[PDB]
Design an enzyme around this catalytic site. Structure first.
Site, PDB file in Angstrom:
ATOM      1  CE  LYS A 199      -3.413   0.921   3.767  1.00 38.77           C
ATOM      2  NZ  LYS A 199      -4.142  -0.366   3.949  1.00 38.77           N
TER       3      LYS A 199
ATOM      4  CB  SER B 221      -0.991  -0.001   1.176  1.00 40.69           C
ATOM      5  OG  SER B 221      -0.415  -0.574   2.339  1.00 40.69           O
TER       6      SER B 221
END
Lengths: 288, 287, 288, 287
Positions: free
Chosen positions: C230, C187
């Site tokens: 996130k 990510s």
């Protein structure tokens, strides 16, 4: 390739419209039909139109530069007489092929006991290892003026847009016809800087201007001999623009007025003044 | 290698019909028994027949290129007289061994005190470091023309099929016989230029053309002298095709009328014109 | 050095009028004292005034671009609000030095043991021989994401103006603090790209934007899991600009609205648009 | 850049008539407005018309191949359906941008315990010193598969138009997303060769074709497993053109008609057959 008739229709319908749009000047500038034909004839030599488009791009961009100096309402028309303002000096001459600009050449003037003579200085820049060749039965003084001219250019690469490494990746050949006829004197210094710079820069030097002058290592254009006899040959050969050192301003009284009327004399001191006046700003060939 | 009669047979039976079917022109062209003999004689030099198969391939594709310009009824036969149309200038000349095209030579002309001479320039492109050799008792001016001619070719490596690195991977040797007789003057610039290019490109330069002319650095062909003496030398040698500068045209009407009508004078004002007229397109050797 | 009052004066009576005049725009544009103060504070970091003179030059030349777009009668006053229209995003902020653009650093959202964490990707380009260190306790997936990011940049040196022989004259070091804590996941791939490109180009990367997205070798910004966790972490950290893969647009609905309305979200497809949005156009340090 | 209907009118009134006249096919062939638009949209990506001029020349010239192959009576109009006959496979698909040809990428078919999935092998060739990176949590069998593919291509530099000294002047990076998912098996061999060859050659690989097949040093495409689930994966993805090993022809006999329904299935023996079918002829990027 395309005929002149075809190129004009192509430029009118597509290329100009496109180049004005990209320049951001649409609605503000137009070109006359005669101006387009002048752009084809004198600023391009071609099969396709990929060069005409370049010049129309230049016209449009110089128009944007004029817009910066001062803006206007409505349209502003560029005629054939107005073209040299936008594109500079005519690169090509169909009417007189010999007169036109040319890379790695320059017009010089020569004294000799018969009278005046024209001296063409040729310079070829080719892939190599930094060697110099000096041919055409050149004397030691004429060879040394070459070397001095070359060294000036080597010390001023950035000033004139020359490669940063031509000193060791290019071989230079300075040739001066006629091959049989011997030649000497310091008088072709600037003429040779003009031709060496032209060859190295790929920028064509003008041949409607004839020049004479001794060059020095720091670029001073010094006086020369036989100014009467040199300028006469220039006039007899149809050259009516001359470059000449400042300190030879006094020698002009020796001319017969009527011929001095015909001539267009630019007096110089720095060799930079000369290269500015001789070299076109745009290169016409790949670097090497 | 095969005999000539045997070389006609594989031409007829296999090579020719193969090259016509491969070029997509089968049924619309033929070559005569005499035309094949001419391809064998004047266009191939070999024990084998690969050059023959190579040349018959060109004949067929040119037939295809003429088929492009216009179609026609049935099949058109190519006789021996037609072959130069299809294959260009005769590459060889066995019956007449001495003026056939050659790699690295050219026919210059000379003014000698007791009348004109024939001037053969020889050039040898060998593996090397970039050195130049100029031999045959050559005066400084004549050596400067070879340098001027070489520099022209160095600036036009693309335009004449020259290698892009011959300036530092090849030693050149210009030689001009006979060895003792000293030679001078600028009147062989194109003569040199031609021989120098032919040697690098491996393309044969014609030896049935005699040329003379001073070359400038950027490639102008400039006037010269001796003209009349020179031109007899060619004549009295048997050469009828003469290359000459454009600015020399005013000296033609000097020499006798039958002598002038007897020659075929190409006027040139650019060394590119000379290299086109002299050099055959396809190279006959490896670099 | 110079007091900001001193600098404002020098700008008002010398630097501004010289730059406008030489841009061919005198009389058409002005800058407020507020505008000049903002240039000093948010666009210069110096004891002198040469950067300030660089910046005012850009305002005047960008004013000339507006003049080409369309002229105006009279005067046009550039206030403090308009400066980024002329100069782009602020290079500095003296008030809080932590969150301003920085060379070779970026904000990423990737896995640590707590999972879904705001990370800072530090990168240093120093003289070397093409070596790459990957420190900060990185798992193999993350180490591999840095290699994919680096290879992309090696294949696009022209595209983003990087040194074209850096691959063997520069050593790279990718560090991810804090040192003890493990990191892993794909990510942070686009963050890697950003921070590495920033370090090689000397162009500072914005630190008020956090980004997340798996980078690919050809440059596709591919989707990532944990979008909720996130963006919550960026919300908790006080970071209000997000870069997200385009394919993760559906996942935004997982967030509460009060949090979602605090995040300026930019969806992306190619890493090319990530770099354009993150990297300030001009480099702020000497090359390498 | 010019707009589309502009590009059309300049193609009609100048470029097409030029290229037909130059090819010597004046009067013989034409193109429809729909077909010209297909050349613009699918075969050029540009501001000007340098790409369009190049391609309309190819149409005229490929017409010149055909008239030699056999003539016709009248004017043969070329529709948009015919354009690929003249220009080959479309180099662009603006409507469907992800399926278009790309340099350094190739579509693989992988099977898993749950089902089938599409692999995308990415390969970047950059200036370097002969290094090879292999990322995407690749297992050892899959890493060795890439080494086999690379070694084959090293031995066949002339055959597939690859730089002769790429082994020591270039670094290769093979990457296979997703970055996190572990991957293993010999099945992606030919898929990798495609991607690596494409990267080195600068020739775009087709992304509307998915493939599967174990590769061997000498170049034999070997049989594989999971033929059913891999074919459902191509359906799931929307890939309707498959490359499969010749030795897996027996595995397609079990398949119910509805799995084979909708697929073009090329069966291959040599890996060179794959590169022929996958890579476009002309390279796009500089080396």
């Amino acid at each position: 390739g395309y005929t002149n008739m075809e190129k004009q229709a192509i430029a009118r319908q597509y290329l100009w419209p496109k180049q004005v749009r990209e320049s951001g000047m649409e609605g503000r500038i137009e070109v006359t039909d005669a101006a387009i034909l002048r752009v084809i004839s004198e600023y391009t030599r071609e099969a396709g139109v990929r060069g005409l488009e370049r010049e129309l791009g230049k016209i449009a961009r110089k128009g944007a530069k004029f817009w910066l100096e001062g803006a206007w309402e409505g349209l502003r028309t560029i005629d054939a007489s107005d073209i040299p303002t936008y594109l500079g000096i005519p690169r090509y001459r169909p009417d007189k092929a010999e007169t036109e600009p040319q890379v790695g050449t320059a017009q010089g003037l020569a004294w000799t006991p018969v009278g005046g003579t024209l001296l063409t200085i040729e310079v070829a820049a080719v892939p190599g290892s930094g060697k110099l060749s000096l041919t055409g039965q050149l004397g030691e003084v004429m060879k040394e003026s070459a070397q001095a001219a070359l060294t000036y250019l080597r010390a001023h690469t950035q000033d004139y847009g020359l490669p940063e490494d031509f000193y060791n990746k290019v071989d230079l050949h300075v040739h001066v016809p006629d091959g049989a006829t011997p030649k000497d004197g310091p008088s072709a210094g600037i003429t040779m800087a003009t031709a060496i710079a032209s060859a190295l820069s790929r920028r064509p030097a003008r041949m409607d201007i004839a020049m004479t002058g001794e060059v020095s290592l720091r670029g001073k254009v010094m006086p020369i001999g036989g100014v009467k006899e040199k300028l006469l040959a220039a006039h007899q050969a149809g050259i009516h623009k001359i470059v000449l050192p400042k300190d030879n301003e006094a020698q002009l009284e020796e001319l017969p007025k009527e011929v001095l009327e015909g001539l267009e004399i630019k007096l110089v001191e720095d060799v930079g003044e000369v290269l500015e006046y001789l070299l076109l700003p745009e290169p016409t060939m790949p670097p090497v």
